[PDB]
Amino acid sequence: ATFEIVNRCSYTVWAAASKGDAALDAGGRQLNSGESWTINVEPGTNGGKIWARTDCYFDDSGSGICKTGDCGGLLRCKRFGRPPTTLAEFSLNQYGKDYIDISNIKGFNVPMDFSPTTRGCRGVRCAADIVGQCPAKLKAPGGGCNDACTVFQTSEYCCTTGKCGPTEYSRFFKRLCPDAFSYVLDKPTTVTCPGSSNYRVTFCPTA
């Protein structure tokens, strides 16, 4: 499958793509404002994620740091990033279908649209000003709006026991972005697409 990753933000982001134990394609790249990066993701990929990283500094060897979404200090991510990270999530060719969603379960850093470029399903978007409206206790100094599990590490926020409800904090994310997951047991906002669809992820789709 092809993913086109587009930075429509006015600031540079460092895109990342991983399935947790491996890079997808090159795993990461700098995207200046307006730039597009096309990657190829193997059919059958389960549990892939794409996200943006902000305020990064990398040396010639591809080693450094980012203020949001850092993946162990690498430009080319092999593992998932440090919250807060708005997440585009996908599993491809699962018994004939692709499944896509956006998640705020690991917080929010950059607004996002995640849409098919082929026919058969709709896209999803979270483009509200979550960072500007972020509750004081969830604000991340480096930028972004943390999820409550990251901040407070309780069974209820992290849904550790497999039983948990919505919370004041999850409802904040859900109010601003109804079409994204706001906590682990949220009513699913997953979209089902035809197997082997292609996609575009756009950072700052309205900004």
Side-chain angles (χ1 to χ4, degrees):
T2 299
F3 285 71
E4 189 179 55
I5 302 171
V6 181
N7 182 19
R8 189 174 294 151
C9 306
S10 62
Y11 47 89
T12 300
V13 302
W14 287 258
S18 174
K19 61 183 192 72
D21 63 345
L24 301 177
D25 199 283
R29 213 201 87 173
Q30 182 174 326
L31 292 177
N32 296 325
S33 177
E35 288 188 332
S36 302
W37 179 36
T38 299
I39 64 169
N40 290 282
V41 175
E42 290 286 313
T45 292
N46 181 81
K49 302 187 198 297
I50 287 162
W51 67 103
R53 299 169 285 175
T54 60
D55 289 306
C56 303
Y57 294 88
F58 293 111
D59 61 27
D60 39 290
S61 72
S63 176
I65 195 167
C66 303
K67 292 195 179 175
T68 64
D70 186 71
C71 62
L74 300 180
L75 169 64
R76 292 162 288 269
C77 295
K78 296 190 297 185
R79 70 192 210 202
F80 293 140
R82 190 173 194 268
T85 53
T86 319
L87 294 168
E89 307 183 308
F90 48 92
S91 294
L92 311 179
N93 310 100
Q94 304 295 301
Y95 303 101
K97 299 293 185 183
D98 291 356
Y99 296 96
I100 67 166
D101 68 82
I102 291 175
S103 174
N104 288 319
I105 291 172
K106 295 290 185 184
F108 176 103
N109 62 338
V110 175
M112 181 187 280
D113 179 278
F114 185 11
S115 291
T117 55
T118 51
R119 292 159 320 308
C121 53
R122 69 174 182 90
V124 286
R125 176 178 296 194
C126 177
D129 187 11
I130 284 178
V131 176
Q133 301 297 352
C134 188
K137 290 187 183 179
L138 299 183
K139 291 182 174 191
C145 189
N146 287 311
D147 67 284
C149 171
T150 296
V151 175
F152 293 105
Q153 298 278 274
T154 68
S155 296
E156 192 64 15
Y157 296 138
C158 302
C159 212
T160 311
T161 71
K163 281 296 124 217
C164 61
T167 67
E168 276 313 287
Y169 296 125
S170 73
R171 290 184 180 96
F172 160 76
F173 288 94
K174 197 65 167 185
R175 168 168 67 87
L176 294 183
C177 283
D179 288 337
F181 282 88
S182 64
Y183 72 109
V184 169
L185 287 183
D186 208 351
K187 173 171 166 297
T189 47
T190 309
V191 173
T192 305
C193 292
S196 300
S197 297
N198 297 315
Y199 303 92
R200 180 178 288 117
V201 176
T202 306
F203 304 121
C204 301
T206 59

PDB file of all heavy atoms in Angstrom, residues 50 85-90 100-105 107-108 110-115 123-127 174 177-182 186 189-191 201-202 205:
ATOM      1  N   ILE A  50       1.448   6.120  12.086  1.00  0.00           N
ATOM      2  CA  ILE A  50       2.145   7.278  11.532  1.00  0.00           C
ATOM      3  C   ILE A  50       1.878   8.454  12.462  1.00  0.00           C
ATOM      4  O   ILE A  50       0.757   8.629  12.946  1.00  0.00           O
ATOM      5  CB  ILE A  50       1.662   7.582  10.096  1.00  0.00           C
ATOM      6  CG1 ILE A  50       2.215   6.526   9.130  1.00  0.00           C
ATOM      7  CG2 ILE A  50       2.094   8.986   9.635  1.00  0.00           C
ATOM      8  CD1 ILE A  50       1.478   6.458   7.799  1.00  0.00           C
ATOM      9  N   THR A  85       1.357  12.380  21.154  1.00  0.00           N
ATOM     10  CA  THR A  85       1.368  12.138  19.716  1.00  0.00           C
ATOM     11  C   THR A  85      -0.018  11.845  19.198  1.00  0.00           C
ATOM     12  O   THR A  85      -0.606  10.822  19.561  1.00  0.00           O
ATOM     13  CB  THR A  85       2.229  10.909  19.332  1.00  0.00           C
ATOM     14  OG1 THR A  85       1.800   9.783  20.106  1.00  0.00           O
ATOM     15  CG2 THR A  85       3.700  11.147  19.589  1.00  0.00           C
ATOM     16  N   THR A  86      -0.531  12.689  18.310  1.00  0.00           N
ATOM     17  CA  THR A  86      -1.733  12.321  17.559  1.00  0.00           C
ATOM     18  C   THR A  86      -1.365  11.127  16.690  1.00  0.00           C
ATOM     19  O   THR A  86      -0.325  11.154  16.051  1.00  0.00           O
ATOM     20  CB  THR A  86      -2.213  13.471  16.678  1.00  0.00           C
ATOM     21  OG1 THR A  86      -2.081  14.694  17.411  1.00  0.00           O
ATOM     22  CG2 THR A  86      -3.657  13.263  16.250  1.00  0.00           C
ATOM     23  N   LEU A  87      -2.181  10.072  16.659  1.00  0.00           N
ATOM     24  CA  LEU A  87      -1.799   8.862  15.930  1.00  0.00           C
ATOM     25  C   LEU A  87      -2.734   8.517  14.791  1.00  0.00           C
ATOM     26  O   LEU A  87      -3.948   8.435  14.988  1.00  0.00           O
ATOM     27  CB  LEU A  87      -1.748   7.658  16.882  1.00  0.00           C
ATOM     28  CG  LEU A  87      -0.664   7.732  17.950  1.00  0.00           C
ATOM     29  CD1 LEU A  87      -0.870   6.654  19.009  1.00  0.00           C
ATOM     30  CD2 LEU A  87       0.711   7.630  17.309  1.00  0.00           C
ATOM     31  N   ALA A  88      -2.161   8.286  13.610  1.00  0.00           N
ATOM     32  CA  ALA A  88      -2.861   7.597  12.531  1.00  0.00           C
ATOM     33  C   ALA A  88      -2.546   6.113  12.658  1.00  0.00           C
ATOM     34  O   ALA A  88      -1.389   5.734  12.644  1.00  0.00           O
ATOM     35  CB  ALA A  88      -2.423   8.130  11.161  1.00  0.00           C
ATOM     36  N   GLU A  89      -3.570   5.278  12.797  1.00  0.00           N
ATOM     37  CA  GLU A  89      -3.378   3.852  13.061  1.00  0.00           C
ATOM     38  C   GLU A  89      -4.019   3.019  11.987  1.00  0.00           C
ATOM     39  O   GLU A  89      -5.113   3.344  11.523  1.00  0.00           O
ATOM     40  CB  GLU A  89      -3.988   3.474  14.411  1.00  0.00           C
ATOM     41  CG  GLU A  89      -3.500   4.349  15.552  1.00  0.00           C
ATOM     42  CD  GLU A  89      -4.048   3.924  16.894  1.00  0.00           C
ATOM     43  OE1 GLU A  89      -5.281   3.772  17.033  1.00  0.00           O
ATOM     44  OE2 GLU A  89      -3.237   3.733  17.814  1.00  0.00           O
ATOM     45  N   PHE A  90      -3.370   1.923  11.609  1.00  0.00           N
ATOM     46  CA  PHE A  90      -3.912   1.098  10.542  1.00  0.00           C
ATOM     47  C   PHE A  90      -3.485  -0.355  10.636  1.00  0.00           C
ATOM     48  O   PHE A  90      -2.386  -0.681  11.096  1.00  0.00           O
ATOM     49  CB  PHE A  90      -3.509   1.664   9.168  1.00  0.00           C
ATOM     50  CG  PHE A  90      -2.046   1.995   9.055  1.00  0.00           C
ATOM     51  CD1 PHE A  90      -1.140   1.063   8.576  1.00  0.00           C
ATOM     52  CD2 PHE A  90      -1.570   3.239   9.452  1.00  0.00           C
ATOM     53  CE1 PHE A  90       0.218   1.377   8.473  1.00  0.00           C
ATOM     54  CE2 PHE A  90      -0.220   3.551   9.364  1.00  0.00           C
ATOM     55  CZ  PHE A  90       0.675   2.620   8.876  1.00  0.00           C
ATOM     56  N   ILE A 100      -8.732   1.614   9.576  1.00  0.00           N
ATOM     57  CA  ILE A 100      -7.979   2.827   9.894  1.00  0.00           C
ATOM     58  C   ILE A 100      -8.678   3.633  10.986  1.00  0.00           C
ATOM     59  O   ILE A 100      -9.902   3.560  11.146  1.00  0.00           O
ATOM     60  CB  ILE A 100      -7.755   3.729   8.643  1.00  0.00           C
ATOM     61  CG1 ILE A 100      -9.072   4.326   8.128  1.00  0.00           C
ATOM     62  CG2 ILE A 100      -7.014   2.951   7.546  1.00  0.00           C
ATOM     63  CD1 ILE A 100      -8.895   5.469   7.116  1.00  0.00           C
ATOM     64  N   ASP A 101      -7.892   4.373  11.763  1.00  0.00           N
ATOM     65  CA  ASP A 101      -8.468   5.274  12.760  1.00  0.00           C
ATOM     66  C   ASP A 101      -7.471   6.356  13.119  1.00  0.00           C
ATOM     67  O   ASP A 101      -6.278   6.261  12.778  1.00  0.00           O
ATOM     68  CB  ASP A 101      -8.903   4.515  14.034  1.00  0.00           C
ATOM     69  CG  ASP A 101      -7.727   3.949  14.814  1.00  0.00           C
ATOM     70  OD1 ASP A 101      -7.107   4.709  15.583  1.00  0.00           O
ATOM     71  OD2 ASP A 101      -7.426   2.749  14.684  1.00  0.00           O
ATOM     72  N   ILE A 102      -7.972   7.394  13.784  1.00  0.00           N
ATOM     73  CA  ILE A 102      -7.117   8.348  14.477  1.00  0.00           C
ATOM     74  C   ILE A 102      -7.352   8.177  15.966  1.00  0.00           C
ATOM     75  O   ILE A 102      -8.476   7.919  16.400  1.00  0.00           O
ATOM     76  CB  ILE A 102      -7.393   9.791  14.045  1.00  0.00           C
ATOM     77  CG1 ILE A 102      -6.935   9.978  12.595  1.00  0.00           C
ATOM     78  CG2 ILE A 102      -6.669  10.803  14.951  1.00  0.00           C
ATOM     79  CD1 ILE A 102      -7.280  11.337  12.036  1.00  0.00           C
ATOM     80  N   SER A 103      -6.282   8.296  16.740  1.00  0.00           N
ATOM     81  CA  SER A 103      -6.352   8.094  18.172  1.00  0.00           C
ATOM     82  C   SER A 103      -5.705   9.236  18.927  1.00  0.00           C
ATOM     83  O   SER A 103      -4.622   9.693  18.546  1.00  0.00           O
ATOM     84  CB  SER A 103      -5.656   6.789  18.544  1.00  0.00           C
ATOM     85  OG  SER A 103      -5.596   6.644  19.950  1.00  0.00           O
ATOM     86  N   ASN A 104      -6.366   9.667  20.000  1.00  0.00           N
ATOM     87  CA  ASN A 104      -5.806  10.575  20.996  1.00  0.00           C
ATOM     88  C   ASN A 104      -5.476   9.873  22.308  1.00  0.00           C
ATOM     89  O   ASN A 104      -5.300  10.528  23.340  1.00  0.00           O
ATOM     90  CB  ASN A 104      -6.775  11.729  21.292  1.00  0.00           C
ATOM     91  CG  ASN A 104      -6.866  12.711  20.146  1.00  0.00           C
ATOM     92  OD1 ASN A 104      -5.853  13.050  19.524  1.00  0.00           O
ATOM     93  ND2 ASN A 104      -8.068  13.192  19.871  1.00  0.00           N
ATOM     94  N   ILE A 105      -5.406   8.543  22.285  1.00  0.00           N
ATOM     95  CA  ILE A 105      -5.143   7.781  23.511  1.00  0.00           C
ATOM     96  C   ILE A 105      -3.743   8.067  24.066  1.00  0.00           C
ATOM     97  O   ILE A 105      -3.510   7.959  25.292  1.00  0.00           O
ATOM     98  CB  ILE A 105      -5.340   6.266  23.243  1.00  0.00           C
ATOM     99  CG1 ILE A 105      -6.826   5.976  23.018  1.00  0.00           C
ATOM    100  CG2 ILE A 105      -4.795   5.409  24.371  1.00  0.00           C
ATOM    101  CD1 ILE A 105      -7.120   4.560  22.553  1.00  0.00           C
ATOM    102  N   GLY A 107      -2.386  11.105  23.597  1.00  0.00           N
ATOM    103  CA  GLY A 107      -2.344  12.553  23.544  1.00  0.00           C
ATOM    104  C   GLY A 107      -2.399  13.123  22.141  1.00  0.00           C
ATOM    105  O   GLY A 107      -2.647  12.421  21.162  1.00  0.00           O
ATOM    106  N   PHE A 108      -2.146  14.419  22.061  1.00  0.00           N
ATOM    107  CA  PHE A 108      -2.291  15.161  20.807  1.00  0.00           C
ATOM    108  C   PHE A 108      -1.137  16.133  20.681  1.00  0.00           C
ATOM    109  O   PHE A 108      -0.817  16.836  21.634  1.00  0.00           O
ATOM    110  CB  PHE A 108      -3.641  15.902  20.806  1.00  0.00           C
ATOM    111  CG  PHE A 108      -3.884  16.785  19.604  1.00  0.00           C
ATOM    112  CD1 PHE A 108      -4.732  16.368  18.590  1.00  0.00           C
ATOM    113  CD2 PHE A 108      -3.321  18.053  19.528  1.00  0.00           C
ATOM    114  CE1 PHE A 108      -4.998  17.176  17.496  1.00  0.00           C
ATOM    115  CE2 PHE A 108      -3.566  18.875  18.430  1.00  0.00           C
ATOM    116  CZ  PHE A 108      -4.415  18.434  17.412  1.00  0.00           C
ATOM    117  N   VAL A 110      -0.196  17.397  16.935  1.00  0.00           N
ATOM    118  CA  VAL A 110      -0.416  18.058  15.650  1.00  0.00           C
ATOM    119  C   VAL A 110      -1.771  17.617  15.098  1.00  0.00           C
ATOM    120  O   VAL A 110      -2.116  16.441  15.187  1.00  0.00           O
ATOM    121  CB  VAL A 110       0.733  17.692  14.651  1.00  0.00           C
ATOM    122  CG1 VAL A 110       0.518  18.247  13.246  1.00  0.00           C
ATOM    123  CG2 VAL A 110       2.083  18.143  15.193  1.00  0.00           C
ATOM    124  N   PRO A 111      -2.557  18.544  14.533  1.00  0.00           N
ATOM    125  CA  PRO A 111      -3.824  18.144  13.906  1.00  0.00           C
ATOM    126  C   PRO A 111      -3.590  17.284  12.665  1.00  0.00           C
ATOM    127  O   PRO A 111      -2.565  17.416  11.982  1.00  0.00           O
ATOM    128  CB  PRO A 111      -4.488  19.479  13.557  1.00  0.00           C
ATOM    129  CG  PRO A 111      -3.376  20.461  13.517  1.00  0.00           C
ATOM    130  CD  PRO A 111      -2.310  19.991  14.444  1.00  0.00           C
ATOM    131  N   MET A 112      -4.567  16.438  12.354  1.00  0.00           N
ATOM    132  CA  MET A 112      -4.369  15.371  11.381  1.00  0.00           C
ATOM    133  C   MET A 112      -5.637  15.016  10.606  1.00  0.00           C
ATOM    134  O   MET A 112      -6.728  14.993  11.182  1.00  0.00           O
ATOM    135  CB  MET A 112      -3.847  14.129  12.119  1.00  0.00           C
ATOM    136  CG  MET A 112      -3.577  12.935  11.236  1.00  0.00           C
ATOM    137  SD  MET A 112      -3.153  11.451  12.170  1.00  0.00           S
ATOM    138  CE  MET A 112      -1.428  11.753  12.530  1.00  0.00           C
ATOM    139  N   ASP A 113      -5.486  14.751   9.305  1.00  0.00           N
ATOM    140  CA  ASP A 113      -6.520  14.116   8.514  1.00  0.00           C
ATOM    141  C   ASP A 113      -5.937  12.810   7.979  1.00  0.00           C
ATOM    142  O   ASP A 113      -4.789  12.770   7.542  1.00  0.00           O
ATOM    143  CB  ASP A 113      -6.966  15.023   7.361  1.00  0.00           C
ATOM    144  CG  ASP A 113      -8.022  14.383   6.498  1.00  0.00           C
ATOM    145  OD1 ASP A 113      -7.670  13.584   5.605  1.00  0.00           O
ATOM    146  OD2 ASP A 113      -9.211  14.678   6.720  1.00  0.00           O
ATOM    147  N   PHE A 114      -6.718  11.739   8.012  1.00  0.00           N
ATOM    148  CA  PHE A 114      -6.281  10.429   7.539  1.00  0.00           C
ATOM    149  C   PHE A 114      -7.369   9.924   6.606  1.00  0.00           C
ATOM    150  O   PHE A 114      -8.456   9.559   7.061  1.00  0.00           O
ATOM    151  CB  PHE A 114      -6.068   9.502   8.746  1.00  0.00           C
ATOM    152  CG  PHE A 114      -5.494   8.136   8.439  1.00  0.00           C
ATOM    153  CD1 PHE A 114      -4.973   7.797   7.199  1.00  0.00           C
ATOM    154  CD2 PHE A 114      -5.465   7.182   9.454  1.00  0.00           C
ATOM    155  CE1 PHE A 114      -4.442   6.519   6.984  1.00  0.00           C
ATOM    156  CE2 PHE A 114      -4.942   5.923   9.247  1.00  0.00           C
ATOM    157  CZ  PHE A 114      -4.426   5.583   8.019  1.00  0.00           C
ATOM    158  N   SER A 115      -7.095   9.944   5.303  1.00  0.00           N
ATOM    159  CA  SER A 115      -8.108   9.637   4.296  1.00  0.00           C
ATOM    160  C   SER A 115      -7.600   8.653   3.259  1.00  0.00           C
ATOM    161  O   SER A 115      -6.426   8.665   2.911  1.00  0.00           O
ATOM    162  CB  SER A 115      -8.558  10.916   3.580  1.00  0.00           C
ATOM    163  OG  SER A 115      -9.304  11.757   4.439  1.00  0.00           O
ATOM    164  N   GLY A 123     -12.727   9.184   5.156  1.00  0.00           N
ATOM    165  CA  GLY A 123     -11.606   9.484   6.024  1.00  0.00           C
ATOM    166  C   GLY A 123     -12.030   9.959   7.399  1.00  0.00           C
ATOM    167  O   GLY A 123     -13.223  10.103   7.694  1.00  0.00           O
ATOM    168  N   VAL A 124     -11.049  10.172   8.263  1.00  0.00           N
ATOM    169  CA  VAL A 124     -11.318  10.708   9.594  1.00  0.00           C
ATOM    170  C   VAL A 124     -10.357  11.852   9.866  1.00  0.00           C
ATOM    171  O   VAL A 124      -9.280  11.930   9.265  1.00  0.00           O
ATOM    172  CB  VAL A 124     -11.190   9.640  10.689  1.00  0.00           C
ATOM    173  CG1 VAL A 124     -12.394   8.693  10.648  1.00  0.00           C
ATOM    174  CG2 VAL A 124      -9.887   8.880  10.542  1.00  0.00           C
ATOM    175  N   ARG A 125     -10.738  12.734  10.779  1.00  0.00           N
ATOM    176  CA  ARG A 125      -9.963  13.935  11.013  1.00  0.00           C
ATOM    177  C   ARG A 125     -10.045  14.345  12.472  1.00  0.00           C
ATOM    178  O   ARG A 125     -11.092  14.205  13.099  1.00  0.00           O
ATOM    179  CB  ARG A 125     -10.478  15.055  10.105  1.00  0.00           C
ATOM    180  CG  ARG A 125      -9.818  16.403  10.296  1.00  0.00           C
ATOM    181  CD  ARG A 125     -10.372  17.424   9.308  1.00  0.00           C
ATOM    182  NE  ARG A 125     -10.069  17.049   7.932  1.00  0.00           N
ATOM    183  CZ  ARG A 125     -10.189  17.868   6.894  1.00  0.00           C
ATOM    184  NH1 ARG A 125     -10.604  19.115   7.078  1.00  0.00           N
ATOM    185  NH2 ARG A 125      -9.883  17.445   5.677  1.00  0.00           N
ATOM    186  N   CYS A 126      -8.935  14.831  13.013  1.00  0.00           N
ATOM    187  CA  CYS A 126      -8.950  15.544  14.283  1.00  0.00           C
ATOM    188  C   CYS A 126      -8.161  16.827  14.096  1.00  0.00           C
ATOM    189  O   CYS A 126      -6.926  16.797  14.071  1.00  0.00           O
ATOM    190  CB  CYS A 126      -8.347  14.719  15.417  1.00  0.00           C
ATOM    191  SG  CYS A 126      -8.262  15.606  17.005  1.00  0.00           S
ATOM    192  N   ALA A 127      -8.868  17.944  13.952  1.00  0.00           N
ATOM    193  CA  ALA A 127      -8.206  19.190  13.553  1.00  0.00           C
ATOM    194  C   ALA A 127      -8.524  20.367  14.461  1.00  0.00           C
ATOM    195  O   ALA A 127      -8.215  21.514  14.133  1.00  0.00           O
ATOM    196  CB  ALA A 127      -8.563  19.542  12.112  1.00  0.00           C
ATOM    197  N   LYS A 174     -12.671  14.002  23.457  1.00  0.00           N
ATOM    198  CA  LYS A 174     -13.816  13.546  22.671  1.00  0.00           C
ATOM    199  C   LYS A 174     -14.706  14.703  22.224  1.00  0.00           C
ATOM    200  O   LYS A 174     -15.271  14.675  21.130  1.00  0.00           O
ATOM    201  CB  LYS A 174     -14.633  12.528  23.476  1.00  0.00           C
ATOM    202  CG  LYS A 174     -15.586  11.702  22.621  1.00  0.00           C
ATOM    203  CD  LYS A 174     -14.814  10.822  21.634  1.00  0.00           C
ATOM    204  CE  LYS A 174     -15.710   9.779  20.999  1.00  0.00           C
ATOM    205  NZ  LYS A 174     -14.909   8.871  20.132  1.00  0.00           N
ATOM    206  N   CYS A 177     -12.677  16.322  19.358  1.00  0.00           N
ATOM    207  CA  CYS A 177     -12.492  15.407  18.228  1.00  0.00           C
ATOM    208  C   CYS A 177     -13.301  14.137  18.384  1.00  0.00           C
ATOM    209  O   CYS A 177     -12.775  13.116  18.818  1.00  0.00           O
ATOM    210  CB  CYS A 177     -11.021  15.044  18.064  1.00  0.00           C
ATOM    211  SG  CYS A 177     -10.106  16.396  17.299  1.00  0.00           S
ATOM    212  N   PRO A 178     -14.591  14.199  18.034  1.00  0.00           N
ATOM    213  CA  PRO A 178     -15.454  13.031  18.235  1.00  0.00           C
ATOM    214  C   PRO A 178     -15.044  11.811  17.419  1.00  0.00           C
ATOM    215  O   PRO A 178     -15.382  10.686  17.795  1.00  0.00           O
ATOM    216  CB  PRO A 178     -16.836  13.523  17.784  1.00  0.00           C
ATOM    217  CG  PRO A 178     -16.755  15.005  17.768  1.00  0.00           C
ATOM    218  CD  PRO A 178     -15.334  15.401  17.616  1.00  0.00           C
ATOM    219  N   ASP A 179     -14.335  12.018  16.317  1.00  0.00           N
ATOM    220  CA  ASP A 179     -14.022  10.898  15.437  1.00  0.00           C
ATOM    221  C   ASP A 179     -12.686  10.235  15.737  1.00  0.00           C
ATOM    222  O   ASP A 179     -12.227   9.417  14.954  1.00  0.00           O
ATOM    223  CB  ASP A 179     -14.063  11.353  13.976  1.00  0.00           C
ATOM    224  CG  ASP A 179     -15.479  11.618  13.499  1.00  0.00           C
ATOM    225  OD1 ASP A 179     -16.441  11.063  14.091  1.00  0.00           O
ATOM    226  OD2 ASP A 179     -15.635  12.388  12.539  1.00  0.00           O
ATOM    227  N   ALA A 180     -12.076  10.583  16.866  1.00  0.00           N
ATOM    228  CA  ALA A 180     -10.843   9.941  17.320  1.00  0.00           C
ATOM    229  C   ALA A 180     -11.061   9.204  18.632  1.00  0.00           C
ATOM    230  O   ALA A 180     -11.858   9.638  19.470  1.00  0.00           O
ATOM    231  CB  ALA A 180      -9.739  10.963  17.496  1.00  0.00           C
ATOM    232  N   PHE A 181     -10.336   8.110  18.830  1.00  0.00           N
ATOM    233  CA  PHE A 181     -10.369   7.416  20.126  1.00  0.00           C
ATOM    234  C   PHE A 181      -9.909   8.339  21.250  1.00  0.00           C
ATOM    235  O   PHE A 181      -8.852   8.968  21.140  1.00  0.00           O
ATOM    236  CB  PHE A 181      -9.467   6.181  20.119  1.00  0.00           C
ATOM    237  CG  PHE A 181     -10.048   4.988  19.427  1.00  0.00           C
ATOM    238  CD1 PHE A 181      -9.869   4.809  18.066  1.00  0.00           C
ATOM    239  CD2 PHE A 181     -10.739   4.020  20.141  1.00  0.00           C
ATOM    240  CE1 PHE A 181     -10.393   3.696  17.428  1.00  0.00           C
ATOM    241  CE2 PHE A 181     -11.261   2.907  19.505  1.00  0.00           C
ATOM    242  CZ  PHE A 181     -11.088   2.746  18.148  1.00  0.00           C
ATOM    243  N   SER A 182     -10.670   8.402  22.342  1.00  0.00           N
ATOM    244  CA  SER A 182     -10.305   9.282  23.458  1.00  0.00           C
ATOM    245  C   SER A 182      -9.841   8.514  24.695  1.00  0.00           C
ATOM    246  O   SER A 182      -9.232   9.102  25.576  1.00  0.00           O
ATOM    247  CB  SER A 182     -11.469  10.198  23.841  1.00  0.00           C
ATOM    248  OG  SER A 182     -12.583   9.453  24.339  1.00  0.00           O
ATOM    249  N   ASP A 186     -13.203   3.436  24.418  1.00  0.00           N
ATOM    250  CA  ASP A 186     -14.097   4.310  23.688  1.00  0.00           C
ATOM    251  C   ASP A 186     -14.869   3.511  22.647  1.00  0.00           C
ATOM    252  O   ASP A 186     -14.351   2.530  22.112  1.00  0.00           O
ATOM    253  CB  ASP A 186     -13.283   5.417  23.021  1.00  0.00           C
ATOM    254  CG  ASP A 186     -14.059   6.701  22.824  1.00  0.00           C
ATOM    255  OD1 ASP A 186     -15.286   6.728  23.030  1.00  0.00           O
ATOM    256  OD2 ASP A 186     -13.421   7.699  22.437  1.00  0.00           O
ATOM    257  N   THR A 189     -14.161   4.235  16.613  1.00  0.00           N
ATOM    258  CA  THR A 189     -14.343   5.144  15.485  1.00  0.00           C
ATOM    259  C   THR A 189     -13.539   4.661  14.291  1.00  0.00           C
ATOM    260  O   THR A 189     -13.217   5.423  13.383  1.00  0.00           O
ATOM    261  CB  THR A 189     -13.922   6.558  15.842  1.00  0.00           C
ATOM    262  OG1 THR A 189     -12.643   6.508  16.486  1.00  0.00           O
ATOM    263  CG2 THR A 189     -14.946   7.184  16.791  1.00  0.00           C
ATOM    264  N   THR A 190     -13.223   3.374  14.307  1.00  0.00           N
ATOM    265  CA  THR A 190     -12.508   2.729  13.220  1.00  0.00           C
ATOM    266  C   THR A 190     -13.328   2.728  11.943  1.00  0.00           C
ATOM    267  O   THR A 190     -14.538   2.482  11.965  1.00  0.00           O
ATOM    268  CB  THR A 190     -12.150   1.293  13.616  1.00  0.00           C
ATOM    269  OG1 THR A 190     -11.499   1.329  14.888  1.00  0.00           O
ATOM    270  CG2 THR A 190     -11.237   0.635  12.587  1.00  0.00           C
ATOM    271  N   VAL A 191     -12.655   2.997  10.830  1.00  0.00           N
ATOM    272  CA  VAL A 191     -13.261   2.953   9.510  1.00  0.00           C
ATOM    273  C   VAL A 191     -12.797   1.706   8.774  1.00  0.00           C
ATOM    274  O   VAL A 191     -11.611   1.372   8.797  1.00  0.00           O
ATOM    275  CB  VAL A 191     -12.896   4.208   8.695  1.00  0.00           C
ATOM    276  CG1 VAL A 191     -13.376   4.082   7.250  1.00  0.00           C
ATOM    277  CG2 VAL A 191     -13.496   5.434   9.349  1.00  0.00           C
ATOM    278  N   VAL A 201      -2.050  10.911   4.656  1.00  0.00           N
ATOM    279  CA  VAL A 201      -2.069  11.507   5.984  1.00  0.00           C
ATOM    280  C   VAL A 201      -1.627  12.946   5.834  1.00  0.00           C
ATOM    281  O   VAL A 201      -0.532  13.199   5.342  1.00  0.00           O
ATOM    282  CB  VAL A 201      -1.143  10.768   6.960  1.00  0.00           C
ATOM    283  CG1 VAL A 201      -1.113  11.480   8.316  1.00  0.00           C
ATOM    284  CG2 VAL A 201      -1.594   9.311   7.137  1.00  0.00           C
ATOM    285  N   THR A 202      -2.471  13.881   6.246  1.00  0.00           N
ATOM    286  CA  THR A 202      -2.170  15.302   6.121  1.00  0.00           C
ATOM    287  C   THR A 202      -2.060  15.917   7.499  1.00  0.00           C
ATOM    288  O   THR A 202      -3.024  15.890   8.268  1.00  0.00           O
ATOM    289  CB  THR A 202      -3.258  16.059   5.328  1.00  0.00           C
ATOM    290  OG1 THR A 202      -3.463  15.415   4.068  1.00  0.00           O
ATOM    291  CG2 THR A 202      -2.865  17.526   5.100  1.00  0.00           C
ATOM    292  N   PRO A 205      -4.520  19.852   8.399  1.00  0.00           N
ATOM    293  CA  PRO A 205      -5.337  19.837   7.179  1.00  0.00           C
ATOM    294  C   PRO A 205      -6.102  21.130   6.927  1.00  0.00           C
ATOM    295  O   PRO A 205      -6.427  21.424   5.774  1.00  0.00           O
ATOM    296  CB  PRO A 205      -6.306  18.675   7.420  1.00  0.00           C
ATOM    297  CG  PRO A 205      -6.361  18.517   8.903  1.00  0.00           C
ATOM    298  CD  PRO A 205      -4.974  18.852   9.384  1.00  0.00           C
TER     299      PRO A 205
END
